[PDB]
Amino acid sequence: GRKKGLPEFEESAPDGFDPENPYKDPVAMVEMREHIVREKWIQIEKAKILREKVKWCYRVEGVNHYQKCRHLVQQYLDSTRGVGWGKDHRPIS
Amino acid sequence: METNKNKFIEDWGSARENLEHNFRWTRRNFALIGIFGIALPIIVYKGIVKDFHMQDEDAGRPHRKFL
Amino acid sequence: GITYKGVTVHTPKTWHTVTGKGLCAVMWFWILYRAKQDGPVVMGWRHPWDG
Amino acid sequence: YEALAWLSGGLGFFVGLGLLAVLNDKASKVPFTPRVYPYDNLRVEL
Amino acid sequence: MAIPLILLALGSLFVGYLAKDMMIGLGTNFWANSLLVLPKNEILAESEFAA
Amino acid sequence: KKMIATQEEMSAAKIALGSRDMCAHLLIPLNKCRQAEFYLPWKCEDERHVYEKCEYELVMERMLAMKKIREEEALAKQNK
Amino acid sequence: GDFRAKVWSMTGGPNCRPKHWRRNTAIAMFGVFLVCIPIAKLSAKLEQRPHMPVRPIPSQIWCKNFGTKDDYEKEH
Amino acid sequence: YFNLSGLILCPVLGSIILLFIPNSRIRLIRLIGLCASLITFLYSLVLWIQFDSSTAKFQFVESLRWLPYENINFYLGIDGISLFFVILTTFLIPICILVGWSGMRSYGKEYIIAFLICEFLMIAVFCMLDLLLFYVFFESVLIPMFIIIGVWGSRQRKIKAAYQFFLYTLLGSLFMLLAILLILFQTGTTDLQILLTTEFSERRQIFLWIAFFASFAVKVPMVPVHIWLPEAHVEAPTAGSVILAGILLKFGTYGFLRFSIPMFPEATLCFTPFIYTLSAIAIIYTSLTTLRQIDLKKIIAYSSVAHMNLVTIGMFSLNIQGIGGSILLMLSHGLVSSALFLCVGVLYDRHKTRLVRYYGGLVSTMPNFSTIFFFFTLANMSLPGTSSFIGEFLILVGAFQRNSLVATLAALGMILGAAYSLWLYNRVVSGNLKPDFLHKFSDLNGREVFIFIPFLVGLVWMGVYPKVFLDCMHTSVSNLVQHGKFH
Amino acid sequence: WATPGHEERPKGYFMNRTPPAPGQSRKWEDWELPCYITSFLTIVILGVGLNAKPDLSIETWAHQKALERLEM
Amino acid sequence: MYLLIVFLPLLGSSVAGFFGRFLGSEGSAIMTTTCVSFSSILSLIAFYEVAL
Ligand SMILES: CCCCCCCCCCCCCCCCCC(=O)O[C@@H](COC(=O)CCCCCCCCCCCCCCC)COP(=O)(O)OCC[N+](C)(C)C
Ligand SMILES: CCCCCCCCCCCCCCCCCCCC(=O)O[C@H](COC(=O)CCCCCCCCCCCCCC)COP(=O)(O)OCCN
């Protein structure tokens, strides 16, 4: 069987997980790992969406691109500050 | 279809293959083997470890022991 | 064509020398016309009505 | 070995000529003031 | 191998004149997004007149 | 001299940054003229000369200002 | 090429000049045209052109996307 | 409903059936071996279609009890990482049968039996989730490849190649086995999922990681022990030389990506600079060594070493770019090295030289082989649009996310890799012919011109559109890099 | 150009296989059918399998969840 | 129209190199010149549609 659609996943964070003793509960480890990776990919796609928005900005902006898209530039950069598995700046989620 | 394989080639080919019989730990070659066997690995190891240390210094995080 | 004392060369084609001469003439004319029009502009003799 | 000195000597001519440009100080003899533009030198445009 | 020569000859006699105004015309609208000209490092207007 | 017609009227035309000087007001009709024609070097002349006049007058203003400042700087190199 | 007439030479031997090459040339042009028709169809299908032209260009005769990207907020 | 077990059983059935029939009917033996290999390949492709790339948990699992307590058992299963290795090892075997198709009457039924046993065993290695039994199958390939190398190998030095190959996989293998036993006694089970979720002692991970690396630094041609690959690879048959550089070199990297990166995360961080230095010096030294070689086989065997060493730079740089590029370059090398060694094999099976200076200026005589060799050595260059570039550049990008020195040396590796690759190309296919020892020689027949067609199409498919391959692995790679990294 | 030329057939033989006598087939090789059918099945199953398979992955799921979440 | 400019030379070379025997020593040359000439013509069309 299949849902023949998008793979719906539980948005709710899994229960029974303690940051002080993660290794105590093994059965809850894998779904917490999956949830963390899914949230990281959500952030990655948000950054990609902002990149697409500035992509479409730069064409219409013309010579004076700084004037009317400066607000979106900061929005795109702050997303790129906490990106996934990247440079030395590791986000603390 | 097999090549003629003239005699003046296989001797040099085997000499390149059988070079293991010519090694007597000469001092100049001993220094040559030692430098590229130890020093360059040590120099590059210091390079990467100090690159990591300088990267971590700017972020302010304490340096990993890196044993 | 003809030989001087052992070397003979084919006559240059009519459709080559004629075009070469005419095109050299027209580029000379273009150069001289450009000199007539904006010659003083690049030599500082007169500015292109901007001061 | 003789050809090597030409590379050092040739580059020596350029840095020697490069040293001459340093000693000439072309930067401070501008006949013009720095450019002025409206709207705070295009601060909103930058 | 003579027609391309003729085309390049007719090019490198008028292309420069026909392109001088339309690529560098002291503020032409030909590089809206292709080039970014810095306001500070913009020695074009002062060059032609102060030289 | 100062501005007369800038900001949104200037913004409407894709004026190159750095080409927005004090007397860039007449540059906008000029740039419609360039877009109107097929960028012919010889077809449009009258509208280009006024912009070169703008730039040329600005260039004399700048050079005379710097000649003035050099005139006071000449007094600075006087050790009695 | 004494022996070179025995090799297949996928792109052509030393001096091939086949007996009937003009017909092969014509069928080659026909094939290139037939294969570049779908390329043209795809190109006309995907082309944004965010800005409207100043004067009517030979475009917008097969391209329908013109001024469709001046809405840079609903972008995925 | 095609499961993982049928794929494993197909080579077994092909081998058992092949032993029943006698050796007089040689055509039946080759036909049945090729048919079994091809149906296994088709089954592997079918398994690809029904692969869920969204979930992080493992695909089809078949559990067969091994100990009476169900403490440890055959736990088969594929993921984003293991699937493509299974596809590649199913794809290479029919090629192996097809290259030596003409000489089958000289080899016999032992040759196809050995190759199908290798296919079975290599499939069992990649798609299983029991750490101990994976070790059993991990060096279980000793016997069949020992037979393949020894029985049909060099003239008289075949004995020494077998011994060096067999000796290099003993001390490190059993030193790994000691760590296997310590892990089994400490935790209690060898199930991979259980072992991932275990608190190992901080001082303990160093010893276990060192023991694991010791047995993987021999399969992956690291600096200390990599001299076996050139000698034992020249002194090897062409079909045994196309899986030795096609699959066996993947065991070390895959073992690193399975039982080393997850289980020992902070040990990986603490040992990161050392691996970087080893890989960089390996790349540089191998690049400088391979440009003064006259053996027709080692010239690309060293290229294989360089590529495998470059793999570890981004494989050990914990990153989605680094690991993804690692597996992409791994598949790319598994194709390109296989193609290069097939080209060397066809060159050798006509002239029987095993040199480089004998061949020269044969482009006027074998143009098809010239084009095919150019394309293969062109892919070895890592051109964009070819297989190697996407993966290798992804490795460079991922490593430069972490460190800025060592992988610059990795990139400097290709400043000479491309150079000596084209220089090697120009030894053979360029210049004037020398008909003093090249009297008669032919071009590729119908078999070996069609054998490269899958290689060509796979290479271009890697080069121009690698999204489908990256699509199925981004879940597994991201899960791998984030394991034991709570924050 | 105007002249038709010479060399009635291109030089060399494809795959070095000598052409058979007229009226006889090419005498397909013993592995020719088993491997050509394998290639045909692989091509078709990749063509219709990799495209008819659902586009389920983490890129598209993250895309949908990023579109739905950015609005708030 | 705009995709054509970059693929006419590629396709023409591909066919003239895979089947250079068919087109001979002159047909291949003339067809490559034809393909690149129409590529340049569409390049001029693109120049008018983009520059002016
Ligand atoms: C990762 C790859 C990315 C794509 C790269 C493609 C670049 C082209 C690759 C092949 C280039 C041709 C090199 C072939 C070997 C060169 C020497 C040779 O063997 O040539 C052959 C074949 O010649 C060829 O070059 C044909 C090969 C095709 C060349 C055109 C390639 C076009 C397709 C590739 C690009 C397509 C566009 C991009 C695809 C997405 C025979 O030449 P003859 O003229 O017949 O000489 C006769 C020999 N003798 C005198 C001894 C009798
Ligand atoms: C000499 C004659 C050779 C004839 C070859 C064909 C003639 C054309 C020659 C050009 C070369 C073509 C090579 C294939 C290039 C494919 C490029 C596009 C691929 C692509 O991205 O689209 C995918 C299509 O999958 C597919 O269906 C691709 C099928 C390709 C089958 C190739 C089989 C190669 C087998 C090699 C095995 C090697 C294994 C090594 C691990 C799915 O795209 P999507 O993600 O958007 O999904 C769609 C969901 N709606």
Side-chain angles (χ1 to χ4, degrees):
Chain A
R2 265 307 299 173
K3 277 73 69 177
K4 62 194 65 40
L6 194 70
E8 293 83 3
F9 281 144
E10 292 294 326
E11 191 148 279
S12 69
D15 52 354
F17 185 91
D18 44 345
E20 67 274 16
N21 276 329
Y23 280 164
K24 195 282 171 193
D25 191 10
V27 72
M29 192 95 58
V30 293
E31 59 266 59
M32 185 63 73
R33 205 184 46 193
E34 291 183 22
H35 160 256
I36 295 194
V37 187
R38 271 180 270 108
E39 287 199 339
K40 298 298 281 297
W41 264 105
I42 301 299
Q43 313 315 91
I44 301 299
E45 182 82 67
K46 172 255 289 181
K48 289 153 96 86
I49 287 169
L50 290 166
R51 205 161 41 101
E52 182 78 25
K53 259 183 67 183
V54 65
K55 194 53 71 73
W56 290 137
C57 287
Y58 190 81
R59 296 170 175 86
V60 174
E61 282 293 323
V63 177
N64 48 2
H65 56 275
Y66 305 100
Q67 271 186 164
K68 54 213 182 54
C69 83
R70 45 210 291 201
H71 67 102
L72 183 63
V73 173
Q74 294 104 29
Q75 306 162 31
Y76 162 83
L77 276 296
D78 61 58
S79 66
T80 60
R81 192 70 272 162
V83 158
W85 311 268
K87 52 175 285 183
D88 71 333
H89 192 261
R90 286 319 309 264
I92 48 171
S93 181
Chain B
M1 293 177 70
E2 190 257 348
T3 56
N4 273 111
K5 205 167 297 172
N6 51 3
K7 199 247 175 176
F8 277 175
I9 304 301
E10 312 91 354
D11 274 327
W12 181 65
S14 180
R16 289 307 215 78
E17 270 157 18
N18 297 114
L19 73 165
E20 282 314 281
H21 301 303
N22 313 131
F23 187 79
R24 285 270 72 74
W25 314 80
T26 68
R27 201 42 51 84
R28 175 78 180 279
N29 204 7
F30 187 90
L32 183 140
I33 189 168
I35 53 172
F36 303 110
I38 314 190
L40 282 72
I42 301 299
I43 297 169
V44 73
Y45 184 11
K46 315 283 211 215
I48 296 89
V49 65
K50 300 299 316 311
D51 203 340
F52 283 140
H53 287 344
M54 301 165 38
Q55 278 210 9
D56 300 332
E57 261 186 9
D58 186 62
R61 62 198 70 152
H63 312 135
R64 198 76 211 270
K65 50 184 173 65
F66 277 124
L67 76 164
Chain C
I2 73 165
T3 179
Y4 191 49
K5 67 173 191 68
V7 285
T8 185
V9 63
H10 306 113
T11 59
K13 307 329 182 159
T14 301
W15 210 268
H16 293 174
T17 69
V18 164
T19 81
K21 200 178 296 299
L23 192 151
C24 197
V26 65
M27 52 85 88
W28 285 136
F29 157 72
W30 165 235
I31 287 183
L32 294 201
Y33 167 86
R34 192 73 267 166
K36 176 162 208 41
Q37 299 293 325
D38 291 336
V41 176
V42 306
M43 294 298 102
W45 284 317
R46 74 151 281 280
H47 62 117
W49 181 358
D50 54 359
Chain D
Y1 292 165
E2 200 281 327
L4 176 65
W6 290 110
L7 187 45
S8 286
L11 259 61
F13 178 76
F14 307 135
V15 295
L17 191 66
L19 269 157
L20 196 40
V22 176
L23 302 177
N24 204 3
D25 189 358
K26 194 73 176 293
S28 65
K29 56 176 75 173
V30 297
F32 62 71
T33 73
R35 302 153 180 293
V36 297
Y37 292 139
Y39 293 139
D40 197 4
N41 264 328
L42 270 58
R43 214 211 71 221
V44 66
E45 278 89 1
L46 294 168
Chain E
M1 81 185 158
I3 284 157
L5 273 287
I6 289 311
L7 274 296
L8 268 76
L10 62 84
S12 66
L13 287 175
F14 293 99
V15 164
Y17 163 72
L18 296 167
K20 192 169 55 95
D21 169 49
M22 61 80 71
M23 292 218 308
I24 46 171
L26 267 49
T28 180
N29 216 349
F30 201 51
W31 310 89
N33 295 325
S34 306
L35 292 183
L36 177 136
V37 177
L38 206 50
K40 62 182 287 185
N41 273 349
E42 196 208 347
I43 61 170
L44 170 84
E46 63 89 21
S47 85
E48 186 172 11
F49 311 134
Chain F
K1 62 186 176 69
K2 56 169 270 162
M3 71 66 78
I4 186 65
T6 70
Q7 195 44 277
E8 72 88 10
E9 196 173 339
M10 179 205 296
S11 89
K14 268 66 154 161
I15 299 181
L17 289 172
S19 175
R20 314 209 170 200
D21 50 354
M22 296 310 217
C23 46
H25 51 277
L26 61 85
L27 183 63
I28 310 167
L30 192 152
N31 70 38
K32 284 84 72 183
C33 290
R34 312 185 85 123
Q35 303 315 109
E37 316 189 348
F38 295 162
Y39 274 41
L40 283 72
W42 46 265
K43 183 68 77 177
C44 184
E45 283 285 305
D46 193 4
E47 174 69 342
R48 273 81 160 140
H49 295 285
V50 287
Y51 194 63
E52 307 159 289
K53 200 158 179 30
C54 166
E55 298 200 346
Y56 182 75
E57 198 274 347
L58 167 61
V59 171
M60 283 74 74
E61 213 276 330
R62 296 174 67 248
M63 65 183 73
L64 69 91
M66 182 94 180
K67 263 170 48 55
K68 183 262 187 180
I69 206 64
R70 197 83 76 200
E71 196 276 332
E72 292 84 4
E73 289 268 39
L75 275 297
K77 58 181 171 48
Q78 181 209 358
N79 200 348
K80 181 198 205 328
Chain G
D2 215 3
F3 64 90
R4 304 218 291 278
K6 302 291 179 67
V7 303
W8 193 57
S9 75
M10 183 177 177
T11 195
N15 208 342
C16 56
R17 274 141 191 251
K19 179 48 202 60
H20 294 89
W21 46 269
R22 294 179 293 173
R23 66 185 297 165
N24 287 121
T25 300
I27 196 184
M29 321 295 208
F30 280 8
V32 176
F33 171 82
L34 203 57
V35 75
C36 65
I37 301 299
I39 294 155
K41 270 183 191 253
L42 182 70
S43 181
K45 265 314 171 184
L46 60 85
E47 199 154 25
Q48 287 69 241
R49 201 72 83 107
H51 286 138
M52 309 307 286
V54 288
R55 279 190 171 182
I57 46 182
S59 182
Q60 71 251 46
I61 62 170
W62 283 53
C63 180
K64 299 180 293 296
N65 314 67
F66 263 90
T68 57
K69 288 300 177 185
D70 45 359
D71 192 34
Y72 63 93
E73 298 86 60
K74 309 304 174 304
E75 294 317 277
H76 313 324
Chain H
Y1 204 46
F2 302 171
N3 51 65
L4 197 45
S5 178
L7 180 71
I8 297 169
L9 293 176
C10 281
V12 176
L13 302 192
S15 283
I16 301 299
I17 291 173
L18 193 151
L19 282 156
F20 283 176
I21 59 175
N23 201 10
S24 70
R25 311 161 207 192
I26 179 62
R27 55 191 183 278
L28 190 48
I29 299 169
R30 50 167 58 151
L31 191 67
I32 199 67
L34 184 59
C35 181
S37 200
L38 293 173
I39 175 155
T40 299
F41 177 61
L42 267 295
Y43 198 86
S44 66
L45 276 296
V46 172
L47 287 163
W48 184 3
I49 302 299
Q50 44 159 313
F51 168 75
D52 186 359
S53 43
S54 63
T55 188
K57 290 313 293 177
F58 296 93
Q59 315 297 325
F60 291 165
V61 293
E62 301 266 320
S63 83
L64 165 71
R65 176 200 66 158
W66 199 68
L67 284 197
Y69 292 164
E70 293 179 353
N71 193 16
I72 56 190
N73 45 1
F74 297 107
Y75 202 62
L76 280 299
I78 62 170
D79 200 11
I81 315 182
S82 308
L83 171 70
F84 284 143
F85 307 143
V86 162
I87 286 179
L88 168 79
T89 189
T90 51
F91 167 76
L92 284 201
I93 298 307
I95 302 300
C96 295
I97 308 302
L98 195 59
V99 298
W101 183 278
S102 80
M104 281 325 317
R105 66 186 297 164
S106 190
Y107 302 118
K109 67 197 297 176
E110 188 170 4
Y111 192 67
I112 304 170
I113 279 290
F115 266 104
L116 274 185
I117 277 170
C118 291
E119 159 161 273
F120 156 72
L121 189 60
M122 292 190 185
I123 288 169
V125 163
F126 283 120
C127 65
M128 71 178 297
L129 299 196
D130 195 285
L131 187 153
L132 162 66
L133 293 172
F134 151 80
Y135 164 89
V136 167
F137 296 145
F138 175 78
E139 61 206 40
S140 167
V141 309
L142 263 51
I143 297 169
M145 299 201 38
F146 163 71
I147 289 294
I148 287 164
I149 299 316
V151 181
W152 293 271
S154 176
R155 284 81 174 269
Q156 56 95 22
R157 219 164 294 266
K158 45 157 72 172
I159 295 93
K160 187 178 186 294
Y163 286 169
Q164 65 182 177
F165 164 72
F166 204 70
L167 198 152
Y168 280 174
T169 175
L170 286 181
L171 61 84
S173 66
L174 287 153
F175 182 76
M176 183 177 176
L177 187 50
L178 291 194
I180 310 298
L181 277 297
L182 273 73
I183 295 182
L184 169 61
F185 176 54
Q186 183 161 8
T187 81
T189 63
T190 71
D191 203 358
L192 189 44
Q193 308 100 46
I194 299 313
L195 294 174
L196 296 199
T197 69
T198 46
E199 164 65 25
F200 279 115
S201 305
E202 182 65 26
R203 49 96 160 169
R204 195 54 89 79
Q205 284 187 356
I206 301 299
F207 169 59
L208 302 190
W209 188 98
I210 285 188
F212 281 173
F213 161 78
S215 179
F216 294 163
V218 63
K219 265 76 161 174
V220 170
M222 281 305 208
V223 176
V225 290
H226 61 242
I227 64 174
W228 58 278
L229 198 44
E231 300 292 329
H233 198 166
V234 57
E235 293 179 353
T238 185
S241 315
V242 68
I243 45 169
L244 166 64
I247 300 300
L248 276 296
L249 294 174
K250 284 53 181 183
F251 284 164
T253 49
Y254 172 70
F256 274 135
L257 286 171
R258 265 315 192 205
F259 306 98
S260 197
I261 299 309
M263 277 161 66
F264 312 133
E266 59 282 0
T268 309
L269 294 174
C270 298
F271 275 113
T272 295
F274 173 99
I275 296 162
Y276 280 166
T277 68
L278 270 186
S279 190
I281 62 170
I283 287 184
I284 289 147
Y285 283 9
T286 294
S287 63
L288 277 296
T289 313
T290 188
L291 60 86
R292 303 283 291 109
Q293 298 283 308
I294 62 170
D295 194 34
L296 194 58
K297 189 68 69 69
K298 295 155 68 76
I299 51 175
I300 48 180
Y302 283 91
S303 162
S304 175
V305 176
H307 270 188
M308 281 304 80
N309 283 121
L310 189 152
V311 168
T312 80
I313 285 169
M315 181 255 308
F316 264 100
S317 68
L318 267 65
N319 196 345
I320 171 166
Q321 287 69 240
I323 290 166
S326 196
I327 296 89
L328 276 296
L329 187 53
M330 201 145 48
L331 269 68
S332 296
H333 174 269
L335 271 73
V336 301
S337 89
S338 71
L340 301 193
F341 284 114
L342 292 192
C343 284
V344 171
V346 56
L347 281 175
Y348 178 82
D349 290 334
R350 275 77 176 273
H351 300 59
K352 276 182 161 111
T353 61
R354 202 139 290 291
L355 273 296
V356 172
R357 61 194 292 171
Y358 278 97
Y359 306 102
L362 79 168
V363 65
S364 310
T365 51
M366 291 156 28
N368 272 340
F369 182 76
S370 299
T371 296
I372 297 169
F373 186 15
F374 177 69
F375 190 96
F376 291 164
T377 195
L378 168 59
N380 192 0
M381 191 146 288
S382 76
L383 276 295
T386 61
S387 66
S388 293
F389 178 76
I390 295 90
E392 186 160 356
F393 214 81
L394 271 181
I395 315 169
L396 291 190
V397 164
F400 290 158
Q401 296 285 105
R402 288 287 94 200
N403 192 299
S404 299
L405 182 63
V406 59
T408 54
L409 306 185
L412 188 153
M414 292 85 98
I415 199 168
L416 189 153
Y420 85 94
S421 83
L422 281 180
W423 198 38
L424 181 43
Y425 176 70
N426 290 318
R427 280 75 178 273
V428 63
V429 68
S430 185
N432 46 4
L433 195 63
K434 276 79 180 173
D436 183 286
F437 39 86
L438 321 173
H439 193 214
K440 55 197 290 168
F441 54 105
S442 170
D443 188 70
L444 315 160
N445 52 358
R447 197 180 61 246
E448 51 206 340
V449 65
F450 182 76
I451 193 166
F452 295 133
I453 277 173
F455 284 154
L456 274 295
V457 61
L459 278 176
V460 301
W461 191 21
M462 211 76 98
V464 298
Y465 195 64
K467 184 205 251 190
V468 298
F469 297 170
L470 287 170
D471 183 8
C472 293
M473 321 165 57
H474 275 329
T475 308
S476 313
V477 171
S478 45
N479 281 274
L480 172 64
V481 70
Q482 209 261 329
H483 168 50
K485 206 167 183 175
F486 305 79
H487 62 137
Chain I
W1 310 89
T3 184
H6 64 100
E7 275 275 17
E8 293 283 330
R9 192 87 272 178
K11 63 186 71 63
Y13 289 161
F14 189 25
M15 293 180 183
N16 296 115
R17 315 163 303 145
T18 174
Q24 287 87 16
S25 63
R26 314 162 91 110
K27 179 63 221 83
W28 270 8
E29 182 46 40
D30 61 358
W31 56 260
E32 202 76 0
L33 188 153
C35 184
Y36 282 4
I37 193 65
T38 300
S39 186
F40 167 58
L41 276 296
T42 61
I43 301 299
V44 298
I45 191 167
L46 291 203
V48 66
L50 294 184
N51 303 303
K53 64 179 180 180
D55 274 308
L56 81 167
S57 163
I58 192 166
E59 281 86 310
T60 69
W61 179 92
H63 187 91
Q64 197 274 300
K65 298 303 302 303
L67 272 70
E68 71 76 20
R69 174 211 61 91
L70 206 53
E71 66 185 2
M72 301 88 88
Chain J
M1 295 296 172
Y2 275 76
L3 272 190
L4 277 300
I5 179 176
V6 296
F7 293 101
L8 319 173
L10 161 75
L11 294 174
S13 175
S14 66
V15 55
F18 296 155
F19 319 108
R21 299 170 297 105
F22 285 93
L23 261 63
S25 170
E26 46 268 52
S28 78
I30 62 170
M31 71 76 87
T32 46
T33 301
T34 297
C35 295
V36 301
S37 298
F38 292 113
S39 163
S40 174
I41 291 315
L42 282 71
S43 177
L44 183 63
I45 297 169
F47 182 76
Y48 176 73
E49 288 188 352
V50 172
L52 301 83

